[PDB]
Design a protein around this ligand. Structure first.
Ligand SMILES: O=c1[nH]cc(F)c(=O)[nH]1
Ligand SMILES: O=c1[nH]cc(F)c(=O)[nH]1
Ligand SMILES: OC[C@@H]1OC=C[C@H]1O
Ligand SMILES: OC[C@@H]1OC=C[C@H]1O
Lengths: 293, 293
């Protein structure tokens, strides 16, 4: 049995119209149930071209094969694609950007009367002590002091939410990655930051008041605390799915090993392949949930 | 002359600007950018293409085979365009997405060995106690507690930078807007938040456990403290410019009055025009800077 998508905002029931501004969609101009009522898997990732490539890739693998219109053709803020029960949505970079996406998304699913939905971010990250190209299935999104919490300011007051992910979904994702046997995949905690450069110990930014050994000491401590990769979205993603009772996972590839460098200098061919990795893993997970009861 | 507070950069054999998809070794920065004097940055890549071409035909470069190539065709992270001494760059939404852009932009300026440069953000925001369509030229970026501070965590420890903007620049842009005499323009403070929904006291996100009354109190306290608009980029932008000693301004139109509502429900025709307002202010400022010497 699949439960209905819920909000934690009593105000939406009471509006004549709900405008999903950054999607360019609205209750008064679109029929959400007709459009989305059969969505069961939502995949989200930074790049709109990667999310279109993902919807193409997913379409072949479930034999929906044969074009894919951008459902947000009225904005350039986010891109959205659909085939069968899979919805792909781009979210840009950083907590604030995904957070805007998530609120309108969840409202979208809620208006569509969707049920039994799974949300999975597929992204990129900096690995810590992993060969580049390793995919990490995140157990706990964790903050830059290693605590699994997400701080928000709400009317000027600090509010904190827990950022763990569904354990069983991680185990199930690992099991899929094992079935493919194409690339290494570990389960690990994931540190989420607000800055790619000073925020992640890089020596490579426009500002930096610290040294290689300072960076090393910080990355090794992260490693000991269980963290295996570093990125910029996992936290709010986990906090908001938890807040609304949605089953969610984060699956990210590792573009380089941060113990060895800051700069992403792999050839473009190799970076592209690395990217196809979480799409393959998640494509396997969708294929199995569908070949099932 | 532009400069970085990062001594590691001078030592690097190459500098790869990964999210621009630009590199010192595949791209000639001085040839591409040395003549740049004004850098305009905004969230949306269509807005910024629109801006570079409005500016082109307002400084007379409005030739017939008018195409302005996206110099970042290479990634889909940001768009970038150039005409003459003017560079127009998109930055996505949220403090982290613009911080990535700034780190790489600043570096780029510096590798191009640019001089006398001005950075302006042209953006959108919610106004407090202003008619919709009002342009705010920001005096101090301020956080959700109304303090002029930008907080960053670096190697696990927390640091703050002041977020004042250049006082002589904000007055100069006030004079420009007055020369156009087309839309209201006020100088005030801008609150910068990490979330568009709960972060700006909205009541229409997927999550909300406060009331309309709490929103009004919070927003009126912001207004009492000098804040005139609310948005998501001003503070890192100020902090980063201040750090690097760059002369920088923020100019945003307000898309609605938050004392009246949360949803952006103006007609497409009206919002498009609101969004050209900061583009016309900044085009004056350029036009007349270029008429000096
Ligand atoms: O947030 C990040 N994303 C991708 C990376 F490769 C990295 O180092 N950090
Ligand atoms: O950050 C914001 N940008 C644009 C808006 F209209 C708003 O309310 N907030
Ligand atoms: O490379 C930029 C970032 O990659 C990881 C999360 C994205 O925002
Ligand atoms: O509407 C979204 C936000 O607009 C204002 C700042 C952008 O990041």
């Amino acid at each position: 049995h699949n439960d209905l998508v819920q909000l934690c905002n009593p105000h939406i029931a009471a509006m004549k119209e709900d405008i999903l501004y950054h999607f360019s969609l609205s209750t008064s101009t679109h029929d959400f149930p007709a459009m989305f009522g059969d969505v069961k898997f939502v995949c989200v990732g930074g790049s709109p071209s990667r999310m279109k490539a993902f919807i193409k890739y997913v379409a072949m693998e479930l034999g929906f094969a044969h074009d894919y219109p951008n459902i947000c053709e009225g904005t350039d803020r986010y891109a959205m694609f659909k085939v069968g029960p899979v919805l792909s949505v781009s979210h840009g970079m950083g907590v604030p950007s995904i957070a805007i996406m998530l609120h309108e998304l969840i409202k979208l699913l809620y208006h569509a009367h969707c049920s039994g939905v799974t949300l999975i971010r597929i992204g990129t990250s900096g690995g810590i002590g992993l060969e580049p190209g390793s995919v990490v299935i995140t157990r706990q999104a964790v903050d830059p002091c290693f605590k699994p919490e997400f701080e928000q300011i709400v009317l000027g007051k600090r509010e904190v939410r827990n950022t763990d992910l569904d354990e069983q979904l991680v185990q199930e994702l690992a099991r899929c990655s094992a079935e493919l046997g194409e690339f290494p995949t570990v389960v690990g905690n994931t540190m989420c930051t607000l800055d790619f450069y000073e925020g992640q110990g890089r020596l490579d930014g426009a500002l930096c008041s610290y040294t290689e050994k300072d960076k090393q000491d910080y990355l090794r401590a992260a490693y000991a605390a269980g963290i295996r990769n570093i990125e910029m979205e996992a936290s709010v993603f986990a906090a908001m799915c938890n807040a609304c009772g949605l089953r969610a996972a984060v699956v990210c590839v590792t573009l380089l090993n941060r113990l060895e460098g800051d700069q992403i200098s792999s050839p473009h061919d190799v970076l592209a392949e690395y990217q196809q990795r979480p799409q393959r893993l998640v494509g396997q997970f969708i294929k199995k949930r569908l070949m099932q009861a």
